[PDB]
Amino acid sequence: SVKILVVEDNHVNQEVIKRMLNLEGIENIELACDGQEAFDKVKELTSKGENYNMIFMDVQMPKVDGLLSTKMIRRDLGYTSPIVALTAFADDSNIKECLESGMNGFLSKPIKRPKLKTILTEFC
């Protein structure tokens, strides 16, 4: 049973990735609009059992951004599962900063379906 959390500040992007994921065969998708909100959805499932198999997270978001969010989830919680950074700033420099921050993979925006697929194969 695959469970995924999508953290993005724009509902339109949430709807699109959720639709691309549904079309890949994944139905259990959860949404959050910022880093703090994602931390809580995760702290919660760290109390139940059914935790997220993967997390897709915007690098930049108000309140709590993606890097700070990742840091909290990694440190404060002990989440060891895959976190994929989403950003349009995709220079090697940018990508390394995401990994340096504890994020396993990256997808550039606007995210492309095949790239999503490629990410699902290597991390899911």
Binding site: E8, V12, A88
Partner: protein, 166 residues
Amino acid sequence: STIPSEIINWTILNEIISMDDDDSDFSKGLIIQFIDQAQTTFAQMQRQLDGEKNLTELDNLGHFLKGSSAALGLQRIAWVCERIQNLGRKMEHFFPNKTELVNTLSDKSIINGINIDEDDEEIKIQVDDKDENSIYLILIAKALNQSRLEFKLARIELSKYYNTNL
């Protein structure tokens, strides 16, 4: 980077449209949602510019609208928003005049029949007390005016595609 020539990247929009096969409700719903996000965001940016002048907020606002515009192929609007983000982070210190930007349009004929300055708005900005942040603010206002125009053009094209004013 150079602003893209085409108003709509059909490669991306066709992809979205290919996911809304049952009922055209999916893709057209995204568009309607975007249109509204754009008008709300332009207004919030304008407010910041005439008041708080918080560059981080303007950055967040550019980031927000770039997400929906880019995912729907409105690549010229998304480009401008990325300039607003970079301006907001004081990473850039220039933004192309409007004329030079319209000259990059793949189909220039989409402009005649309309005043391209029709939606322009001036920024209420302290010119005397111009600190080192004035440039970023003025540059973001210039880009907001460009955005209002690109939004306009995107609605023209989306309207002829859907055959119905959006």
